[PDB]
Assembly symmetry: D2
Homo-oligomer: 495 residues x 4
Amino acid sequence: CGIVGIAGVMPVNQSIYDALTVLQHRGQDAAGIITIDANNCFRLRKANGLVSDVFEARHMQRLQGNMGIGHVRYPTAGSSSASEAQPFYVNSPYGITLAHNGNLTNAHELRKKLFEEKRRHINTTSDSEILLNIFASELDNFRHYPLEADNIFAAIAATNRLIRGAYACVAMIIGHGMVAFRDPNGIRPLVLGKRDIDENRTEYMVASESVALDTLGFDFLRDVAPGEAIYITEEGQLFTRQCADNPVSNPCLFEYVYFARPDSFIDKISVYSARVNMGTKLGEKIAREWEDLDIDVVIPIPETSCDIALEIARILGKPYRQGFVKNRYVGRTFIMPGQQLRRKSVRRKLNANRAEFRDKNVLLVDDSIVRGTTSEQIIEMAREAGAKKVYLASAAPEIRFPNVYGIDMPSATELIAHGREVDEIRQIIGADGLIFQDLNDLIDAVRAENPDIQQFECSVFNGVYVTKDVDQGYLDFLDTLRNDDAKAVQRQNEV
Amino acid sequence: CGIVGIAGVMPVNQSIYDALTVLQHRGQDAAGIITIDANNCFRLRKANGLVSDVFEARHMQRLQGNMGIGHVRYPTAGSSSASEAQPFYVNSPYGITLAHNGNLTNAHELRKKLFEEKRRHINTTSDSEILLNIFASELDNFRHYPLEADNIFAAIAATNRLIRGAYACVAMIIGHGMVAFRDPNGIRPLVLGKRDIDENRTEYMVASESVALDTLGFDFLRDVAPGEAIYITEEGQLFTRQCADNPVSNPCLFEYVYFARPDSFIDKISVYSARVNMGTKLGEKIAREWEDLDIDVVIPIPETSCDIALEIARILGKPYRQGFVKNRYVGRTFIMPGQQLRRKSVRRKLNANRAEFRDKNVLLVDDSIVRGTTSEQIIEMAREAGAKKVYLASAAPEIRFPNVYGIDMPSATELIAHGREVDEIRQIIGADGLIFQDLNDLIDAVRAENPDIQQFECSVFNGVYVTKDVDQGYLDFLDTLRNDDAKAVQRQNE
Amino acid sequence: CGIVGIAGVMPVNQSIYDALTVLQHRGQDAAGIITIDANNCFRLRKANGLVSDVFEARHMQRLQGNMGIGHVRYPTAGSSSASEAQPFYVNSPYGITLAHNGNLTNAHELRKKLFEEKRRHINTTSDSEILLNIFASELDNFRHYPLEADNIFAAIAATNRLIRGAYACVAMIIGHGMVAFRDPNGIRPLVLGKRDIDENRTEYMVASESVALDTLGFDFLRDVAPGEAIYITEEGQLFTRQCADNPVSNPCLFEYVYFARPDSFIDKISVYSARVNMGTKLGEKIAREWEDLDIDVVIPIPETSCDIALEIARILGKPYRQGFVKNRYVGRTFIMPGQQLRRKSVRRKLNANRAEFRDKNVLLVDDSIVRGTTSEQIIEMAREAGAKKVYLASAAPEIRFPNVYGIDMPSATELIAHGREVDEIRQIIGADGLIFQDLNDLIDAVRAENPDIQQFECSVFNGVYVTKDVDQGYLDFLDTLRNDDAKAVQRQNEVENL
Amino acid sequence: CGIVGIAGVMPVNQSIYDALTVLQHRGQDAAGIITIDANNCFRLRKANGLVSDVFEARHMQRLQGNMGIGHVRYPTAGSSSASEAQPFYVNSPYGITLAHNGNLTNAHELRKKLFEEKRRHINTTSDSEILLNIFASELDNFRHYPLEADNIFAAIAATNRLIRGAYACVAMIIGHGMVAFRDPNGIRPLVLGKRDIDENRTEYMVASESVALDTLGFDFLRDVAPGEAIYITEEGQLFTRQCADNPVSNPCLFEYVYFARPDSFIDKISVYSARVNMGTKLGEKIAREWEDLDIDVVIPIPETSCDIALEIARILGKPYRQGFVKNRYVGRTFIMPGQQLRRKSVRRKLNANRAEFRDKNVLLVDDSIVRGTTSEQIIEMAREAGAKKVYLASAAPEIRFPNVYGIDMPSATELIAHGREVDEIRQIIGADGLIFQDLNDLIDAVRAENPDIQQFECSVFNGVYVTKDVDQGYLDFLDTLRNDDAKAVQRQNEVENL
Ligand SMILES: Nc1nc2c(ncn2[C@@H]2O[C@H](COP(=O)(O)OP(=O)(O)O)[C@@H](OP(=O)(O)OP(=O)(O)O)[C@H]2O)c(=O)[nH]1
Ligand SMILES: [Mg+2]
Ligand SMILES: [Mg+2]
């Protein structure tokens, strides 16, 4: 998911829309924008789809005001396509709205405590609504008016003690202003920027990725620190404050491998350069362990892996060629009455340039292997194009555990690397050879760009969950969320 | 506006939709339906437009569950076309949603108290959102779970003491059930019905008008009494309770004149038969005061007045003829870059039968006169059709004061009767004669069908507001709403 | 169906839209408008639904120009809801568009001929597309340009020979102007009107009914004559000419009974007055035949029959009461997975005022009886409302044969009056009594407003088709059109359930 | 624009859609699909927007049949976003529909001829409707039925003699089948493929580019030849014929430079390899003429130039770095009452990786320079990202003349290179240095993948127009279309705002 907040001095509706279009890669399922207008009321538009489809001229006319937040949704367990999008808001106390990228690992417990202790109903299965209601609960403890910055930071601190998981959040409180804050492990990304208007007026903004600030001409200030909160008043004063105990920086490694845009800087690390370093490390691993293999050409599975595969080819002294082309535009496969049922095909996303495979031993490079269904189909496409041997190298280590921090993944049983060794994975997918980045090399490739990061969030790779509350029990509460998601999606199709 | 609530034993989405389609005359601007599904979550669809345009197949699939409420909106000051429709809901305490037909005369004070004492923000200018938050605030006082019927009625009693105005309300509380309640002066209409499914299972419903029960095959039980509350649990038990001090029945006169459907029975009065009575009284008054006039034909302004004009013609011993035909379908006027300026016409709503006016002294009958714009244009249509003399009779008395109880009216300065006598109105609208029902006759015509009603809500006619809190100051706070209503609409078209 | 054409000196899009809205009762399934813009090109918008939903502001900006035509469709066979609507157009010769209310009875023969002699393909099952292509092929025989009015009139005469059935039509020819014409037996209605803008410029319009002239402030000129053709040039001159051999006036009778609006005048006959007379004729017949029956009240089945039942209640010297209320708003029923309807379909349409039926012998009045299922259920409503005895009177004669002149009718097999006698019909539907209007009485009621009309189109009542082309083969052709129209409608709903 | 035609033995709707999606880069303004269903009726769905927006579930149940064509529109003059999209059809003779990538240079003459000699009205300004009518005209001379292959090819040859310009067409004729043909200079791309379903039933398809064959699993047969016509019958038989005298292969160079997809093979030439070769020639030219310049890094303007820049960086022994990222999603700007944009035009399209420019002399590589306002703003971006010297290299020669053969382009007075030398362009756009591909190097680079091609369509670079009818009368005719296209688009926006 992606989030943005703009505390401006002139209308923000178009700017938030623009920032969301450059964060659109963080989630295409739904989008929402909410502003505070001159009457101190929330104006909202959200709906399924891409940003450019969700917001029409009439909705922009509605989204009046100089402060607002936006969200793009990647479907995750509990927040399925069939469900209500973000942002959510509550009318009490004061009027609060929140958007968030991440996942709460104690959602279930929090729901119960909200009900039993506060009689606060949660109407969806989105942990974002839970998070909003905890925050609102802590804000409701104050009697005096207005709230002071210390009251707001105290409720954020309280929230951080109650909730666990990973989160970057932006929120607004009517009559007060905009807050943003980050989980105490710095897992999910969040940056702060500013745009000077004149001697007395500065605008501020926060976003998941720095490209959102770039595209609007905001000056990058810094990453929001692990556990830190920001509060920008309606009058434009900036406050900051640490609101977690023992904050530490454990950035998500998947942002660098695949999820974020290459022109972003996350926790001082250029995503582009991290990815080039991944290619260096994997190229060096291939040169040492596959010295005996006959490789004619190195071919990326676009788009993420193009620069990774270029660096591998360079280390190996081998030609780089664009043997695959990704269709910029993908369409739906309709269900006509009867007729051909053809579906679940990878040619809808990729086309092979036949001349780049014919009678060649090809080294394919992908960013990751998840279910392995897609890589099996890619290998077959390469053989149909005339490849002799097909080798596959993964920029990411083996993906063996589910991500419960906001990156959507199948359960452990649908991960091909779960319970299996490289050579077994190789035989299932039909490759003549298969090699994965080593985790310590992936870690080193990213630390190279900021050696101050001592540990990353690696759970999908090694099963170490830094929030220490993930057990097989909890993994089964998540399957009963994915079960209900798929029924809600399913009952929309019947329509 | 119109409301409906159904506490069923099987899915209610289609039934609520069907009920709203037969209450659609109570408001065409917007529609909303909300249900409670099997997961004890609210499912909502609301939007601008007619019921048939608001709810499509994908929305009905969403609206799961066996309990639900619906609303159709008539644009009113505070709840403009451009604004959020009903129903509203809040997630705390418990999860509450409400729909309402009426208006709160102390909305302004209530909003302030909600903010200062409860930190409860109101995001729209709809008094129904305020009403919901007052109710939620009183429900929030209880700690034990679940609430008992007694707690709910107590929070309603507390709400009635805080709010003033007119209201028929239906609401749902997650984990509990459906409530309905009516203001202590019984101004806005509300009826209760039931449908037996078997020996242990009965469904209940409430609606603004009895025709909603009829169309779904619910047995009519009774009007909800002034100040009464109804609570139907999720398991199908009905409780009732008086929740106001000194309740009294002052039904809105306007429902009988024009607003309700003729096949409804409100507080035991057939609307159709009240309207025939209005015809009897006005025809008699015409026979007495206009004895010397040459009248050739009696022509109603359709559709409300058709049965009224019939009774008038029968008293006068004069022929009834359908001189005007109401276009069942009306369309928009479009703004094109080179566009024409002729929007104002009433020919877009009405067509004259030329043969029925040529060389005749015509007595036209309409249900009411508000701005007089439409009347002037209707009289002119009769003259263009060939009429010689044109007389106009109004089933309702002179409309001189704004309605602040849920019937949308213009401000007193846009009311043509405001500050004017009959003959002066007559000459503005271009008529050769003008006559109004007497208020006491209108009252007698409706009271004939239920003599138990001592006093009606008559404020549009005589300026007597039964809630005793309407002063020129409050009339100004309403102009500030209509001021902001129009700014929202100008922003949409633009 | 209903049709409008306006030859104006100023933009026509809004005016046509408003004319279609007051003709909307003639067909609610589809609508279309086509204009000729200032570049001499057609601009078109047509689609399923009501006029108010079909035409949005984006479609209306496109419909530029001072001349255009409009159509609203009533759904039939060969012109189903799921099919392409009117108007249709062809770009050769010259550029022609046409809109028609009616039905050709030699449609099959005409399609074959168009294919064989002119290699003209017909893409739809709409007879109006066939009619348009005949007219196009007749205009294609002239070399010189521009066409003269004589040419255009010739082409229309040649068309009248070729085709058979009932038709009112309006068409436009790019570079020339607007035409309208009526079938040679004047079955389908069509009127002409004018509107003076100044001494030099006059606008003209034609419409299915006069209320469309009225609503736009056009002065009525006359009904178009059977077989007559109107031609209005782009420069605003009105030409006319008889284009049929043997033109006679046989206006359709169902227009008067319930299809037209009461405030229209069709061939000099007031629909409203026609209908009051029908109440007179039928109330007399009731008093004579049902002298011995105890009628408490006359209750109409709204809305067409309210004025009919009023007159009947007068003749019978009995009270009239609004015992039924037609629901102004009927919604869609949703095909809902595993759900049950609480709502009887008769209640979708009507509601009963309980107090007006309770413990009374009631005489219900309806405008007609087609399938009898509907009639049966209305009677049932009265009983559960409290009525003791329930009598039913029908303002029209028994309906026994289908209309093939433009009025969508079920097949004879479905008409409850086919092969059945009146006391038979009564037993099925459940009436304690049933009576019909006599065709001769119905005819008297209508001729009384214009004795110059000697014969009416009465086929639905008596089986006599003025075109003489109606046989069991053509009826089977119209039923293979129904099946395919119903198979195409079914396919839209299979796939519109994702 | 891009075109598809599939002549199959099972439903083609989804296949045609899938193929248009992989040709979607050839035009995103509008899309149309039309099929011949079981009753030899055309079935159509066309509208503005992307393929995935245009065709909903409801439109695809409608598009029944085993034969069909498709089109995606790149917005040009006379075929604007606010205009009716392709495909068009006519219903005489027989029923014909056609889809076209190209442009007729004698469109005005051909409309005159169609009107005077045939009385065929052309309702839009799309030259595709004119081409369809000319062909329909030539097909109507043949009177006996059915048409024979030789009749159809005769019609196509007659059409090629009448029309001038550039075209790739696919068309269908009801009752007969599908044809496809190519202008006699082979300017616009068109390939042919097949898919064997057993030893009796082969499906065929044509398309603008081979990737559409690939994505559906059709084996590639060959490029349709310059002036050649293909005809595929309803039974499944493939015939061909040369239908021009003096056919010659002059393929569009712009397809190779950037318009086509790299994974396509156009006249036996891999677009990918041609673009690598373009970077080789350009890196060589730079190594020679800029020997003395200090280049830190080569940075492509994505996406088309990434492979070109990689090869240049190779030739120069300098680092290649992704300093610019193209924004995959662009979104609309709303006409905003009293509002100030915070977003520069150039930032909607591109974003700068600041770390890749800071304190470096950078060589930017782009596929072309047209107006140069864009290029100026990209150079400014690099400077604000922190670059010292900013050099710019264009994979294409100077663009000096308008393309009149189907690639939308501005008029010559709008082209920055028109009437100017390299150093003047450099100073205007604000580059420290500027260098263009030499035209002979471009020709060599593309030729090296197939030396059988002697000459290319180069008009935009050198003014040589191969069809020899591009006068000021036609260039004025085009600027008249653009003026009216603008007025129509402006009217749509005003009506929406209002
Ligand atoms: N630019 C342009 N577009 C035209 C013109 N004429 C029609 N169209 C558009 O193409 C579509 C025409 O197809 P329709 O007649 O609507 O038929 P269909 O919806 O059953 O496919 C419409 O888009 P749609 O997606 O179906 O939307 P809607 O307008 O029907 O709601 C309409 O807006 C024209 O002259 N110029
Ligand atoms: Mg909506
Ligand atoms: Mg459409």
